[PDB]
A paper describes a structure:
Sorcin (Soluble resistance-related calcium binding protein) is a calcium binding oncoprotein expressed at high levels in several human tumours, such as leukaemia, gastric, breast and ovarian cancers. The SCBD can be divided in two regions: EF1–3 (residues 33–134), which binds calcium with high affinity, and EF4–5 (residues 135–198), which mediates dimerization.
To investigate the structural basis of Sorcin activation and of selective calcium-dependent signal transduction, we here solved the structure of the apo Sorcin (apoSor) and, for the first time, the structure of Sorcin in the calcium-bound form (CaSor). Briefly, the monomer is formed by two domains: a Gly-rich N-terminal domain (residues 1–32), partially visible in both apo and calcium-bound structures (residues 30–32 and 26–32, respectively), and a calcium binding domain (SCBD), containing eight α-helices (A-H) organised in five calcium binding motifs (EF1-EF5). Indeed, the rmsd values measured by superimposing CaSor to the apoSor clearly indicate that upon calcium binding Sorcin undergoes a large conformational change, mainly involving EF1, EF2 and EF3. The comparison between apoSor and the calcium-bound Sorcin structures sheds light on the mechanism of cation-mediated structural changes of Sorcin, which is fundamental for the comprehension of its function. Tyr67 is placed on the loop between helices B and C, and in apoSor it is hydrogen bonded to Asp113 of the EF3 loop and is partially covered by it. Upon calcium binding this interaction is broken since Asp113 participates in ion coordination; the rearrangement of the EF3 loop causes also the exposure of Arg116. The superimposition between the CaSor and apoSor shed light on the mechanism of Sorcin activation induced by the calcium binding to EF3: the binding of the cation promotes the movement of three calcium ligands (Asp113, Asp115 and Ser117) towards the E-helix where Glu124, the bidentate ligand, is located and consequently, a large movement of the D helix with respect to the E helix (about 15°). This movement is transmitted to the EF1-EF2 subdomain via the Tyr 67 placed in a strategic position, in the middle of the loop connecting EF1 to EF2, and anchoring the EF1-EF2 subdomain to the EF3 loop.
Numbering used by the authors:
A (entry chain A), B (entry chain A): 30 to 198
Write the structure that this text describes.
């Protein structure tokens, strides 16, 4: 069995059960350099990542999930860079719209406006907020799709299931 | 017409249109001392507050909304203090459950677990995360109730409306 190059970072912070929480993910994401020159992800953003991958509200994730996370974040960063050619670490609401669309998110104009207002300061969205945005979008889209068993694009949400689901991200 | 004691803090940071964004709210919340000894609210948490009150994704709020916000946060802080008598600035998942229940949130046990995992580090929830939790809970509960026109406790969410709504908080 081949050694995976991500394993050292993970093994150095995992608990006794072979899992990591948000705090430990924060550390191994920073050591592993996934942000590649941009500001490293804060604890809050790492909590969102944990929920996106564990999809079970344990607050922890295993190595296989860490590897999947790492590949997803690597691709999102490359995508961001194609809009941030000068590497400012920011992007504007027009660039954000086009960035979200091209990565497979299907969003009405007012959905995009909701998102721009949510994450912009001074007409700009940081790399870190862009990633947080993508993590939460993918987690919520996975949650919605999971529940849309009839594939109608509409989900019937009981209140407590809605709260459970949306408060995890 | 009587002067309101909150107006000075608001007027010092409002834009030309008489509204404030999250950044300006952050400043006037800190100057106004609403956190009362606990750590002042960060920008992200102030973004959630703006969405809770404006309920329209403009990213801004007026003075009347600021006043309502201030009263809501004052009551939540008092409520927190009744569980944080020694004023550690933290609370544990058992205290959090009872705190949420007594302030009128109706949450199943697994909804509460979702929330504890989402905000706890080392078995503790900070005052600032408690407030963020309450802001998001009230905003999402308002969003759900608004849409539950038949009062069945179930809402039919189209995907883009779901995303719009949940990405604002």
């Amino acid at each position: 069995q081949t050694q995976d190059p991500l394993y050292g970072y993970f093994a150095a912070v995992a608990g006794q059960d072979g899992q990591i929480d948000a705090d430990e993910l924060q550390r191994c994401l920073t050591q592993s350099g996934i942000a590649g020159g941009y500001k490293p992800f804060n604890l809050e953003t790492c909590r969102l990542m944990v929920s996106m991958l564990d999809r079970d509200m344990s607050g922890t994730m295993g190595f296989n999930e860490f590897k999947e996370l790492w590949a997803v974040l690597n691709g999102w960063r490359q995508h961001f860079i194609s809009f941030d050619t000068d590497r400012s670490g920011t992007v504007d609401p027009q660039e954000l719209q086009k960035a979200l669309t091209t990565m497979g998110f299907r969003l009405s104009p007012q959905a995009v406006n909701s998102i721009a207002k949510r994450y912009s300061t001074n007409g700009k969205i940081t790399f870190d907020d862009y990633i947080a945005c993508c993590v939460k979008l993918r987690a919520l889209t996975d949650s919605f799709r999971r529940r849309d068993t009839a594939q109608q694009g509409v989900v019937n949400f009981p209140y407590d299931d809605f709260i459970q689901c949306v408060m995890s991200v």
